Amino acid sequence: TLAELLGRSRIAQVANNHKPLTYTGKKFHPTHQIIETKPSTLYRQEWGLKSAIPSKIKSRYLVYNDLDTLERITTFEPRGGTQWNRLRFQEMGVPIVSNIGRQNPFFKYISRPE
RNA sequence: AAUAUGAAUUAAUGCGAAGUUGAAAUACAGUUACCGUAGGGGAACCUGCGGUGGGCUUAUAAAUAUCUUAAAUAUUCUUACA
Numbered sequence A: 001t002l003a004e005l006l007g008r009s010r011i012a013q014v015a016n017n018h019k020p021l022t023y024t025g026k027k028f029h030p031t032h033q034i035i036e037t038k039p040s041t042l043y044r045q046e047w048g049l050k051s052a053i054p055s056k057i058k059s060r061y062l063v064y065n066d067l068d069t070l071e072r073i074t075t076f077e078p079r080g081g082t083q084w085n086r087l088r089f090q091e092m093g094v095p096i097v098s099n100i101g102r103q104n105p106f107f108k109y110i111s112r113p114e
Numbered sequence B: 001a002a003u004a005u006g007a008a009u010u011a012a013u014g015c016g017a018a019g020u021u022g023a024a025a026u027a028c029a030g031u032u033a034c035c036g037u038a039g040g041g042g043a044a045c046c047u048g049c050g051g052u053g054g055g056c057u058u059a060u061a062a063a064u065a066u067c068u069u070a071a072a073u074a075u076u077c078u079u080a081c082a
């Protein structure tokens, strides 16, 4: 059915987020999912959102909150810069270690009631 | 006692022409107007108290914005590729 397809659509895959797109507090990790469009689609203002992104946007990365609003605009910011922070961390090749010597969370360890 | 008539006597008002004394109202009408009420004054009107808008909704910024392969690759593409 159409409902089944919609639930699995790429737009459905992005978790609902209404966090401020302009946040001036302390940032410790990414808050919005970066959206990327290919160069061919960018030439046609196609991002896979509800409406065409304004042609003024030359970046290929954005973050958004609402597909449409009462102001008849998309709420988005044309930035994708948290990906470069992650890739620069990867280039520094420093593994993240636990200062408390806890078990690795990414391994299925056999824990006990200690 | 009622009804009708006339009535000394006396009250209110309309229209007509037509000047006079002011300039109260319509614009922020030159003191916002009007409602109720009270007092005062040649005349409109003036003043006090509250009410109404049938006057002020007539309302319109203390400005400041961001990084990924610009192309041998996107931009071309005509039912083709798959």
Ligand SMILES: [K+]
Pocket: none
């Ligand atoms: K007056």
Ligand SMILES: [K+]
Pocket: none
């Ligand atoms: K009055």
Ligand SMILES: [K+]
Pocket: none
């Ligand atoms: K009065």
Ligand SMILES: [Mg+2]
Pocket: none
């Ligand atoms: Mg006067």
Ligand SMILES: [Mg+2]
Pocket: B024, B029
């Ligand atoms: Mg006058």
Ligand SMILES: [Mg+2]
Pocket: none
């Ligand atoms: Mg006046």
Ligand SMILES: [Mg+2]
Pocket: B040, B046, B047
């Ligand atoms: Mg007086």
Ligand SMILES: [Mg+2]
Pocket: none
């Ligand atoms: Mg008054």
Ligand SMILES: [Mg+2]
Pocket: B055
């Ligand atoms: Mg008036």
Ligand SMILES: [Mg+2]
Pocket: none
């Ligand atoms: Mg008015």
